[PDB]
Design a protein around this nucleic acid. Structure first.
Ligand SMILES: [Mg+2]
Ligand SMILES: [Mg+2]
Ligand SMILES: [Mg+2]
Ligand SMILES: [Mg+2]
Ligand SMILES: [Mg+2]
Ligand SMILES: [Mg+2]
Ligand SMILES: [Mg+2]
Ligand SMILES: [Mg+2]
Ligand SMILES: [Mg+2]
Ligand SMILES: [Mg+2]
Ligand SMILES: [Mg+2]
Ligand SMILES: [Mg+2]
Ligand SMILES: [Mg+2]
Ligand SMILES: [Mg+2]
Lengths: 44, 199, 135, 109, 138, 176
RNA sequence: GGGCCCGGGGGGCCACGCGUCCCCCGCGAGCGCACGGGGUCGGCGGCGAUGUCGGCUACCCACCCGACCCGUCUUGAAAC
RNA sequence: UGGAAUGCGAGUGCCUAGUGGGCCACUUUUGGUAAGCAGAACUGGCGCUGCGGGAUGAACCGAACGCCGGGUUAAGGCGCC
RNA sequence: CGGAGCCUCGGUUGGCCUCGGAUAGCCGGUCCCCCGCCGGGGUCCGGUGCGGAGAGCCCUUCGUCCCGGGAAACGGGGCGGCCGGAAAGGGGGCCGCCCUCUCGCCCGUCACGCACCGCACGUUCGUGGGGAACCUGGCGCUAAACCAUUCGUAGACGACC
C-alpha cells in the first residue's frame, strides 16, 4: 500500500510500476484508436 | 399514523409474523375482518387443531388458564401474542399497539385498508390446496356473533356501494372537466407529461 | 460543485435555502450568495460537507467577484461584553452585496421559474426518501 | 421550513441471540429496505432526541427541555437495509422502537 | 381466456435479470421453465432464459423454431418490433416511469407549480358542472 | 464429491507410472463431471482404481482440461446412463433431459436423483452421457417438447415481489 | 526459447572523466518537495452568576440483554 | 562435503505437596435378553473449564479465557419470538 | 359556557374521507335494449405487466410592497336553520344573512426584512395530556354514600335482605 516503503525494500519496484503505467496507458490508446477506426469504417 | 389492514384473504400465521414485527418497531396496527382470515389445510384438520387446544386446561383449576378465546379477532390476537416477547415490558407495549376487530366497525369502515401481499392466500398457496376460514372455525368452537357480524357487514357494504357510485360520479365529472378546460390547462399538462407524471 | 451551481444549505439559520455557489475560498470553504433579495442569504461562507449540490446551474462565467472577498473578509470579529454587543452590517458589505448581486440576478431571471425556485426552501415530506431522488 | 432529516427507528442493539453489544445500535430507515440502498446513509449523522424534566442549554438558543445523543451511521447490517449506528453514549433501552433522526450531512452528493 | 402464449416467435419483455428492460423473441422452448431467446435487434445474445423473468407481449414474429440469428433479426426488422413497441402504452408507461425517477430538484419544483395551477382550474370547472347538474334536478 | 453449483465436464487422461517392465504404459481417458478440476482428478483415481490395478500413488494424470460444450446455443436431448446405491441396493437407471450443455444435463441428473430418490452425489456413478435424437427419446416428459408448433400460456403467475411493497392498497392480479 | 535477450551488415538503460596496461574485437556545494524510523493544525464556532455548566463512581428509579443458593462430600448439586 | 527431511537450546541434582472412589465418547472388546448394566484396549474429554452453537443439559459440535476498540470468522443459523 | 401564566408527562415533526371482490380472470365508459325501488343484466367501445396506477393521489410554508399578463367573477372570509350518522352514532355538505374582500392561485415587474459575520436540540401535532392555583363575566345545582339504629328472607366476623 505504501509506495516509498516498497522502494526501501525493493527499489526496482519503481521501475516495474512506471513501466506498467506507461504500458497500460499505451495499450489503452491503441484500443480506442482501433475502435474509433472501426466505428468510422462502419459509418462508411 | 395507523396502519390499517384487512384480514380477508390473509393466511393467519403470515399476517401475524408481519404484524408482530411491525408493532415491535413502534407502529400501530389495526386488523379488521379477522373472521375473513384463512388457514392452509382442509377445514377439518384445522378444527381438530383448535379442539386439541381446547382440551388444554389446568386439571386442578381450569379457570386459571389457558384461556381459549373463541372470536376470530381474539384468535388472531393470541397468535400475534405468540410471536412477541409478551412477558417483558417491551413486548406488552407492542401488544398494546395492535387492535383486532371482527367486521369493520367505525372509524375504520370509512378509511382505506391496506393488504399484505406476502400473506395473501392467492399468493402463498397453490390454488388446489384446501384452506379453512377463521370465522367458520371460530363459529364452530363457541363463537356467538357470526350471524350478527355478517348482518352488520352487509349494511356496511350497501353504504360503501353508494359511496363508490358517488366517487365514480365525481370521477366522470373530473374527466369531463378536463376536456372543458383543456385549452386553459394544456400548458400545465405539458410540464407533467415532460416529467412522467402524466402518460 | 461548479461555479453557478445551486446548493441546498443544511445547517445554520439559512438551512434549507437554495443558494448560488460562486467560488471556493483559499481556506477551502465555499462562497455563496442567495442572492440576498431572493432568499435573504448574503455573500456568506459555507462548508461543502453541509450542502447538497443540485444539478441546476446558471452560467456565471462572466461575473466579476471582487478580489478582496477572501477568508479574512468573512472571518468573524470578536465583540466584548462587560450589556450586550450587536453585530452591524458594515457599509462596505452592503456595497459588495449589490455589486455581485447585480451581475448574478439578471442571469437567474434568464432561466424561467428559477428565481421562484431560489425563494423556496427544501424539505423532506411524506414518502420522499433522499437516497431515491435526484437533486 | 420543513423536515430536513430522514425517519429511522431504533430497532435494537447489536447482538447474537444471548449476548448484547450495547455500543452498536441497529437502525431501520424509512424507505430503505435493501442493502444496496443503504449506501447513501453511511457516515451520516444520527440523533436520538428526547425531553427531560430539567432545562438544559440549547446551542443558538435559550435553555429548554430538549436533549440529544449524537451518533452516526457506520455500516450496513444484513440484506434488507438495516444500518449500524454508533453514538457518543450507548442508547437507552427505552429508546427502542422510537424515532432516530438521520441527518443529510455529512453530504457526499 | 388466455390471450398470450409462449410460442416460437413470441416477443417477451424481460422484467428482471441482467437483461431487464429489453425485448427478446422466443426461438425455442427447452423445458417447462426455460426457453431459448434472442435479441438480435435489442442487444441480447441467444441464450436460455426462464419464463419467470419474462412478460409476454402481443407481438408474434414468424420464423421457424431454432432458426439462426440471421432470420430472427430479419423477421424483427420486417415487423419493426422496435418502433411498434415504442408506440404501445406499455412502452410509454415505462418511459413515464423513468422520466419521473430522474426528475431533478428543480424539475420537481416546476411540476409542483404546474400541478398546483392545473388542479385548481379543474376543481373550479367541476364545481360549475356540479352546480349545473343541480339545476336540472330542480 | 459434492455436486456443488453447475458441474463442468473434464477430460482426464492418466497412466501407470513407467517401469522397466513397461516403459510406455497405455493411456486411459475418462469423462468426469465435477465442480472443479481438483475434484475431477480425485474422481478419476476413484474410477480407474475400480477398473484397473492403478491408483494415485502408482500412476499420474497426464492431461486434465475442461471439455467445452460444442453447441451451447442448440437445444438437445441427453440420455444418461447411471448407477446408484439406494438404502437397500444398487440400480442402473436410464434418464433423459433437455438442455443446451451436456454438463448442464448432468447437473440436472444430480438434482433430479436427489429430489426423486434422496440419492447423494457420492452414491451416483454417471456411466455414459449421449446426445439423443427426438425420435429415440423414451421419457414422455422430454417428448412433449418435440413439437414444432408448441404453444402454451403461463397460468396463475404468482407475485414474486411480495415485499416490495410489503403493504399495498390493491390486491395482486395473477392473470396476465 | 537461452547465450549481460550471441556475432555481422520510435523508445527505455541504477551507461555517461581520463591517461592508459589490456581480456576481447575514496570528503563538491547549496536549496527544496516528500506515500520516507507511530498526529498534527502556524484551523474554526457556540454558551455561561440564580439558573446554568462539569461530577466516572456512589443514592433512588426505569428499561434492554444476562442471571438457579451458598459451604460441602461427590464421577455428577439449583437439587426432592 | 558434522554424511536423510522437519522442528526445537539442552543436561543434571536435591527437597517436595495433593492424589491413589473417577466417570464419559469415536473405534476395538468380554459377560449379559438388555440396561443411563458390569469389565477391558486406544486416543480424546469432563473431573479442574469458562465461552459460541445443540431451546434446555458435566462429556456432543466449534473453540479454550488478561482489560478493551475495530475487522473477520468456526460450528451453527437468517418467517416472528 | 366565554386571560395571563406556573408545575408535571411524554412522544411526534403533512394528509389520503371507505366499492365489493376475482385471481384459468379483471377494471372503466356506454342505457340504444330488457327489468326495478336513480339501481341490475345484455350489447357495443375502451384499458389490462393494473396509469380511472398506493410504482399512486392531494397539500405544499420565506413574508411583504409597487405595477402588468394569464386564472376567478357561478369567487374567497365571516353569524342564523333543515336533512343527515347507532357495530364503538358526524366541529361533512346544503339553504338563508346585515356583513367582509377584491388578496388568496400561476408567469412576470419592483424592492425591502437582523445580511446575527461556515456549524447542534431548527421546523409542526400545539390553545397537546394531567395538576394546583390566580383572576375575570354569564347561565345553572342545591346531593348522596358509609357508620350508628332497626330487620332476619341473612349470617363464623365482615357481607347480605
Ligand atoms: Mg362456555
Ligand atoms: Mg419537539
Ligand atoms: Mg432473560
Ligand atoms: Mg458434605
Ligand atoms: Mg453418589
Ligand atoms: Mg453446591
Ligand atoms: Mg432432584
Ligand atoms: Mg462402563
Ligand atoms: Mg474430585
Ligand atoms: Mg487439564
Ligand atoms: Mg472445556
Ligand atoms: Mg434439542
Ligand atoms: Mg470483536
Ligand atoms: Mg435460532
Amino acid at each position: 500500500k505504501n509506495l516509498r516503503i516498497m522502494l526501501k525494500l525493493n527499489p526496482y519496484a519503481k521501475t516495474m510500476r512506471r513501466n506498467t503505467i506507461l504500458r497500460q496507458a499505451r495499450n489503452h490508446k491503441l484500443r480506442v484508436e482501433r475502435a474509433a477506426a472501426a466505428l468510422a469504417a462502419k459509418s462508411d | 399514523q395507523v396502519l390499517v389492514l384487512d384480514g380477508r384473504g390473509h393466511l393467519l400465521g403470515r399476517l401475524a409474523a408481519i404484524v408482530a414485527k411491525q408493532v415491535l418497531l413502534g407502529r400501530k396496527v389495526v386488523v379488521v375482518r379477522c373472521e375473513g382470515i384463512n388457514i392452509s389445510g382442509n377445514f377439518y384438520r384445522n378444527k381438530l387443531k383448535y379442539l386439541a387446544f381446547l382440551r388444554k386446561r389446568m386439571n386442578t383449576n381450569p379457570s386459571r388458564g389457558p384461556y381459549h378465546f373463541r372470536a376470530p379477532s381474539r384468535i388472531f390476537w393470541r397468535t400475534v401474542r405468540g410471536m412477541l416477547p409478551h412477558k417483558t415490558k417491551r413486548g406488552q407495549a407492542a401488544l398494546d399497539r395492535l387492535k383486532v376487530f371482527d367486521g369493520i366497525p367505525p372509524p375504520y369502515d370509512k378509511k382505506k385498508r391496506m393488504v399484505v401481499p406476502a400473506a395473501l392466500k392467492v399468493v402463498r398457496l397453490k390454488p388446489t390446496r384446501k384452506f379453512a376460514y377463521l370465522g367458520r372455525l371460530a363459529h364452530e368452537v363457541g363463537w356467538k356473533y357470526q350471524a350478527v357480524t355478517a348482518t352488520l357487514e352487509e349494511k356496511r357494504k350497501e353504504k360503501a356501494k353508494i359511496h363508490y357510485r358517488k366517487k365514480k360520479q365525481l370521477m366522470r365529472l373530473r374527466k369531463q372537466a378536463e376536456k372543458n378546460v383543456e385549452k386553459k390547462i394544456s400548458k400545465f399538462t405539458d410540464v407533467l407529461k415532460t416529467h412522467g407524471l402524466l402518460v | 460543485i461548479t461555479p453557478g451551481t445551486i446548493l441546498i444549505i443544511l445547517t445554520g439559520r439559512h438551512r434549507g435555502k437554495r443558494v448560488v455557489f460562486l467560488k471556493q475560498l483559499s481556506s477551502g470553504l465555499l462562497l455563496v450568495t442567495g442572492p440576498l433579495s431572493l432568499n435573504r442569504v448574503p455573500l456568506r461562507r459555507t462548508h461543502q460537507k453541509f450542502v447538497i449540490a443540485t444539478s441546476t446551474k446558471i452560467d456565471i462565467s462572466g461575473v466579476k467577484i471582487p478580489k478582496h472577498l477572501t477568508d479574512a473578509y468573512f472571518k468573524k470579529k470578536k465583540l466584548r461584553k462587560p450589556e450586550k454587543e450587536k453585530y452591524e452590517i458594515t457599509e462596505q458589505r452592503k456595497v459588495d452585496q449589490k455589486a455581485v448581486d447585480s451581475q448574478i440576478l439578471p442571469k437567474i431571471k434568464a432561466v424561467p421559474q428559477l428565481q421562484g425556485y431560489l425563494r423556496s426552501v427544501f424539505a423532506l415530506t411524506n414518502g420522499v426518501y433522499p437516497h431515491k431522488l435526484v437533486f | 421550513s420543513g423536515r430536513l432529516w430522514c425517519k429511522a427507528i431504533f430497532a435494537g442493539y447489536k447482538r447474537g441471540l444471548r449476548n448484547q453489544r450495547e455500543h452498536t445500535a441497529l437502525l431501520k430507515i424509512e424507505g430503505v429496505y435493501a442493502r444496496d440502498e443503504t449506501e447513501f446513509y453511511l457516515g451520516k449523522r444520527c440523533a436520538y432526541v428526547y425531553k427531560a424534566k430539567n432545562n438544559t442549554v440549547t446551542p443558538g438558543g435559550k435553555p429548554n427541555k430538549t436533549r440529544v445523543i449524537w451518533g452516526k451511521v457506520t455500516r450496513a447490517h444484513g440484506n434488507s437495509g438495516m444500518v449500524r449506528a454508533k453514538f457518543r453514549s450507548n442508547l437507552p433501552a427505552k429508546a427502542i422502537g422510537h424515532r432516530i433522526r438521520v441527518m443529510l450531512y455529512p453530504s457526499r452528493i | 381466456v388466455f390471450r398470450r402464449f409462449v410460442e416460437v416467435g413470441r416477443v417477451a419483455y424481460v422484467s428482471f435479470g441482467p437483461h431487464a428492460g429489453k425485448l427478446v423473441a422466443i426461438v425455442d422452448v427447452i423445458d417447462q421453465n426455460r426457453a431459448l431467446v434472442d435479441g438480435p435487434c435489442t442487444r441480447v445474445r441467444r441464450q436460455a432464459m426462464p419464463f419467470k423473468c419474462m412478460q409476454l407481449t402481443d407481438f408474434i414474429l414468424k420464423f421457424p423454431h431454432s432458426a439462426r440469428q440471421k432470420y430472427v433479426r430479419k423477421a424483427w426488422e420486417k415487423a419493426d418490433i422496435n418502433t411498434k413497441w415504442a408506440a404501445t402504452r406499455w412502452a410509454k408507461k415505462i418511459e413515464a416511469r423513468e422520466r419521473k425517477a430522474k426528475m431533478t430538484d428543480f424539475d420537481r419544483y416546476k411540476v409542483m407549480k404546474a400541478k398546483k395551477m392545473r388542479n385548481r382550474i379543474i376543481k373550479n370547472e367541476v364545481k360549475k358542472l356540479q352546480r349545473a347538474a343541480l339545476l336540472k334536478a330542480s | 464429491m459434492k455436486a456443488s453449483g453447475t458441474l463442468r465436464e473434464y477430460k482426464v487422461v492418466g497412466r501407470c507410472l513407467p517401469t522397466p517392465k513397461c516403459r510406455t504404459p497405455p493411456l486411459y481417458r475418462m469423462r468426469i463431471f465435477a465442480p472443479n478440476h481438483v475434484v475431477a482428478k480425485s474422481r478419476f483415481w476413484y474410477f480407474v482404481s475400480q477398473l484397473k490395478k492403478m491408483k494415485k500413488s502408482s500412476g499420474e494424470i497426464v492431461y486434465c482440461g475442461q471439455v467445452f460444450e460444442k453447441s451451447p446455443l442448440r437445444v438437445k436431448n441427453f440420455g444418461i446412463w447411471l448407477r446408484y446405491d439406494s438404502r437397500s441396493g444398487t440400480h442402473n437407471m436410464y434418464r433423459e433431459y433437455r438442455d443446451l450443455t451436456t454438463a448442464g444435463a448432468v447437473t440436472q441428473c444430480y438434482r433430479d436423483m436427489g429430489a426423486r430418490h434422496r440419492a447423494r452425489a457420492h452414491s451416483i456413478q454417471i456411466m455414459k452421457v449421449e446426445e439423443i435424437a427426438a425420435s429415440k427419446c423414451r421419457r414422455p416428459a422430454v417428448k412433449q417438447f418435440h413439437d414444432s408448433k408448441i404453444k402454451f400460456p403461463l397460468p396463475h403467475r404468482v407475485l414474486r415481489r411480495q415485499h416490495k411493497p410489503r403493504f399495498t392498497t390493491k390486491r395482486p392480479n395473477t392473470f396476465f
